[PDB]
Amino acid sequence: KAGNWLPGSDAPAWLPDDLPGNYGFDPLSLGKEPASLKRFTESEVIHGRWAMLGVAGSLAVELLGYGNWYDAPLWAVNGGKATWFGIEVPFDLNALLAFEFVAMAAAEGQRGDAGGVVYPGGAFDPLGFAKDSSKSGELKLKEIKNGRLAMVAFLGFVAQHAATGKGPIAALGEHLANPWGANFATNGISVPFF
Amino acid sequence: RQSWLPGSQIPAHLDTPAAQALAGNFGFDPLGLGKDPVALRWYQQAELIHCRTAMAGVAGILIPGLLTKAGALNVPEWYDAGKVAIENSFAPWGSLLAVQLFLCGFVEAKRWQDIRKPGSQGEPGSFLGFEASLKGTSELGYPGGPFDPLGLSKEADKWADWKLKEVKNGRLAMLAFLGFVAQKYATGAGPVDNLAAHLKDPWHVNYATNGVSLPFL
Amino acid sequence: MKDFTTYLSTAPVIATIWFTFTAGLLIEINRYFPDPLVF
Amino acid sequence: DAALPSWMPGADLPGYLNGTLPGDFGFDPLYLGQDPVKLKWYAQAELMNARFAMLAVAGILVPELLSNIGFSWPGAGVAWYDAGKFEYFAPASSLFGVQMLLFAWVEIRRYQDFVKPGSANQDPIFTNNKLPDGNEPGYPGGIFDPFGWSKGDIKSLKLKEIKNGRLAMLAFAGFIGQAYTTGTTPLKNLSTHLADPWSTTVWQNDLARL
Amino acid sequence: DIAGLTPCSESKAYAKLEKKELKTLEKRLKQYEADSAPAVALKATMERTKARFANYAKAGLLCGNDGLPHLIADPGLALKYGHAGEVFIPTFGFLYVAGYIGYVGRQYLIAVKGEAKPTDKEIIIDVPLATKLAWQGAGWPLAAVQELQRGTLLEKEENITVSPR
Ligand code: CLA
Ligand code: CLA
Ligand SMILES: CC1=C[C@H](O)CC(C)(C)[C@H]1/C=C/C(C)=C/C=C/C(C)=C/C=C/C=C(C)/C=C/C=C(C)/C=C/C1=C(C)C[C@H](O)CC1(C)C
C-alpha cells in the first residue's frame, strides 16, 4: 500500500495491498465485494485518465488565450464557427455530435467487450514503458495519484466557476494579486453569514 | 418500565420482547394499532420516516426563521417561502414537482422493496456494483453504506442511546410542525413571531386569548 | 345495584340513552351552528 | 462515597465519581455522568471548554487593563464585543476560512488521538519527531510541554487547571450576561461596583430597568 | 358557470327569495308589540334568516333559475371550481363515521362470540367492553386495512352455510 490516509487507523481487511494507490481510504465500504471493487477500480482509472486530459486541455486553452473552459461551446449557443488553435473548423453542432457519438460508441464498445481490462498495453504502449512488470506497479501508483489530483482539480474548476465566474487561470492570478481579499471566503456564497 | 401513564394497563402487544426492542417504547397505544406484529413493524418504519422528515422540515423552518429575526438571514415565512422561491426561479412548480415525484418515487420504491424483503436490494448485477452497499443493517430502517458516512453506528454501547435521540426528537418535531400549522391558522404570523409575542406577555397572549382555540370562551 | 345496572344495560335502555345522547348532540350542534348546508 | 473533598459535606454523593478524574467533588445533581462513555466524553469536553474559556477571559481582561494605563496600541478603546467590526489587514471571512481549516486539522488530530490513545503521536512530515509513548486524551505533553512542568506534582497541577478552567468558564458566562444587561465592558462594571458596592448590585440594576 | 348556473352571490332570484322571506316575517311581526316575547322570537328568526342567506352566498354556492342553491357531485368539478365542501368532504366524513360504527359493532360481536353465552351479551349490552371498543374505534380505517391485508377480514367458503342449489 502507498500509506495510510488517516494516521493511527487500520486499513480495511478487504483492500488488497498490491492494488495501485492503496491508501486504505474506504470509510463507506463501497468496495467491500470483489466484483464491485474490480469495476470501481477500472472506473477510477478511466475517470482519472479523462480528468487528466480535461484538466490539461482546460489549462492549455486558457493559457493560450483561446478563452476559458466554460466559453468553449459558446460558439454553438448563438451561432458561430469553432476555432482550434486559431484555425477555423467547418463542422456544426449537429454534425459534431454524430461523429463523436459514433466514434466514442465504437471505441467504448471495443473496450468494454474485453471484460473490463484496465491495463491493456500492446498497441497502446508502443514505446514499451512497461515492458517489465517490476516497474509497472510503480508507474501505476503515479497514474492513479495524478488521476485523483486531476479529478479534484476539475471539481475545483467547476466549483470556483459557479462560485465566482472567472476561469481557473484568471482565478489564480486574482488570488496571487490579493490572497486575503480573493479566496473561497470572499466569493459570497460559501459562507452566508460573512 | 418507563410508561406514558403511571398505573395505566400497558398493552400486551407492546410488552413483547420484539416490541420493547424499538426505541422510545413508552407503552402508548390506546387504540391498539400495533397489535399485529406486521402492522407494528410497518408503523415503526412510518414513524421513523415521519421523524426524519419532520426533523428536516422543522429545522428548515425554525433555523432560517431564527436567523431572519437577527441580521444573519432574510428568509421569508415558511407559509410564504414557496411563492417567493418560485417567483425568481428557473422552472414552474409543476415541472419541479414532476421531477421531484420521479426522483422520490425511485428511492421510495427501493426502500419499499427492502421493507418487503430485508437486504433484497443487494441483488448481484443490478445497480452497477452499488447494490452491495444498498443492504442495510439487521434492523429495518437503519441502513449503512452510503448512508451514515461518519460510521457512528458501529459503537453498540451508544447505539441503543443514539436511536433514543432520533425517535424522541423526531416525535417533538412532528408536534412542532403541527403547531406551525395551527398557529398559522390562529394568529396569522410566523412561529418565531408567535414565540416573541408570547414572551412579551405570556399571561394574556396564548391559545385561550385568540378566540379561535376556545370558541365557547 | 348489580341487578339495576344489568337492567340499565339491556338493549332498550341502552338504545334510549344512546339515541337521546346522539339526538341531543345533533340538536345542540344545529343550535350553535344554525343552518349548516355545506362545509 | 470516600474521603475526597466534596461540594456538600455529609451529602450522599453518587458512586460513579471515584476521584480518578481531576477536580472530582461529586457534583452531579442531574446525574449526567452516569454513563461511563458519556462521562469519558464530558471530561474531554470540559477540559477543552475550560482551556478555551481561560484564553477567552485572559484575552478579554488583558487588553482592557492595558488600555486604562499609559500603554497604547491600535485597538485599545474598542470593546471585546466590538472587535468584530474593526479594520484589519484582511476581511473577517478570509480569517474565518483560514482558522476553520487549521482548527479542522488540529481537531481531527486530537479526535484521532482521543478515540485511540497514542495513535496520533507521530509527526507526519518528520518521522523522527514524536510525542512520548505514555499519553492520555486531553493531556498531550511532549512538545506541548517544552519545559517539563508536568514531571512534578501532576495531580495538584491538574487540579489547578480544572479549577481555573471552571472559574474562567463562569467568568465568560458573566461577561456575556453583563454585556447583554448593562451594555458596557466588564472592567467598567467592576469599577462601577468598586466605587459604591451597596448601590451597585445586580438586584438594583435589574430593578431600575424593570 | 357550471351547467349554466350562476353563483348565489350574483343571482336576482336569490335576493328576491330572501326579500320574500324577510317580507313575510316582517309582516307577521307588525301585529305584535315591541317588548314582547313573540316580537323577540320573530326578530331572532329574521336574524337567523339573514345570517343563513349571507352564509350561503359567502360559501360560493351555485344557484339556479329558481334562486335556490345547487350541489356539485362530480369530484373533478368540485375540486376544480371550489365546491368540495358540498359533496366530497361530507362524503368522506360519513364514510369515516359509517366505518367507525361498523367496526365498533363488528369488534363487539367478534369479542362476545367466543364467550359462553353470546346471546346474553347481545340482548344485555356489556357497557365496559362496548365503551372500550367505542373509544378504540378511532383507528378503524387503519385496523380495517391491516385486517384486509392479513386475510383475517373475510371468512372462508367452507365455513359458511349455503343452500342445496
Ligand atoms: C362515479 C362516476 C363518475 C362519473 C360519471 C364521472 C364523470 C365525469 N368526470 Mg369524474 N371522477 C370520478 C367519478 C366519476 N366521474 C372519481 C371517483 C374521481 C376521483 C378519482 C373522479 C375525478 C375526476 C377528475 C379529476 C375530473 C373528472 C372529470 C369528469 C367529467 C368528464 C371526464 C370524464 O367523463 O371521464 C371520466 C373521469 C375520469 C376518468 C377521471 C380523470 C379525468 C379525465 C382524464 C378527464 C380529464 C380531461 C379533461 C380535464 C376533460 C375536460 C375537457 C374540457 C371540459 C376542458 C365527467 C362529467 C373531469 C372534469 O370535468 O373536470 C372538471 C376532471 O378533470 N372526474
Ligand atoms: C354490527 C352491526 C352491523 C354491521 C357491521 C353490518 C354490516 C353490513 N350490513 Mg347489516 N344490519 C344490522 C347490523 C350490521 N350490519 C342490523 C342490526 C340489521 C337489522 C336492522 C341489519 C340489516 C341489514 C340488511 C337488510 C342488509 C344489511 C346489509 C349489510 C352489508 C352492507 C352495508 C350496509 O351498511 O348495509 C346496511 C345496514 C343496515 C340497514 C343496518 C345498520 C344498523 C346499525 C347502523 C349497525 C349497528 C347497530 C348496532 C346496534 C350497534 C352495535 C352495538 C354494540 C357496539 C354494543 C354490511 C356488510 C345488506 C346486505 O345484505 O349485505 C350486502 C343488507 O341488505 N344489514
Ligand atoms: C473513494 C470514496 C470511497 C469512500 O468510502 C466514500 C467516498 C467519499 C464517496 C469516496 C470518494 C469519492 C470521490 C472523491 C469521488 C470524486 C470523483 C470525481 C471528482 C470525479 C471527477 C471526474 C472528472 C472528470 C472525468 C472530468 C473530465 C473533464 C473533461 C473530460 C473536460 C473536458 C473539456 C475540456 C477539456 C475543456 C473544454 O473547454 C470543455 C470540455 C469539453 C468539457
Ligand SMILES: CC1=C[C@H](O)CC(C)(C)[C@H]1/C=C/C(C)=C/C=C/C(C)=C/C=C/C=C(C)/C=C/C=C(C)/C=C/C1=C(C)C[C@H](O)CC1(C)C
Ligand atoms: C401514536 C398514536 C397511536 C394511538 O393509538 C392513537 C393516537 C393518539 C392517535 C396516536 C397519535 C398520533 C399522532 C399524534 C400523530 C401525529 C403525527 C404527526 C404530527 C406527523 C407530522 C409530520 C410532519 C412532517 C413529516 C412535516 C414535514 C415538514 C416539511 C417537509 C416542511 C417543509 C417546508 C419547509 C421546510 C419550509 C417551506 O417554506 C415550507 C414547507 C414546504 C412546508
Ligand SMILES: CC(=O)/C=C/C=C(C)/C=C/[C@H]1[C@H](C)CCCC1(C)C
Ligand atoms: C445509454 C444506453 O443505452 C446504455 C449504455 C450502456 C452500456 C454501454 C453498457 C455496456 C456494457 C456494460 C458495462 C456491461 C457489459 C456489456 C457492455 C456492452 C460492455
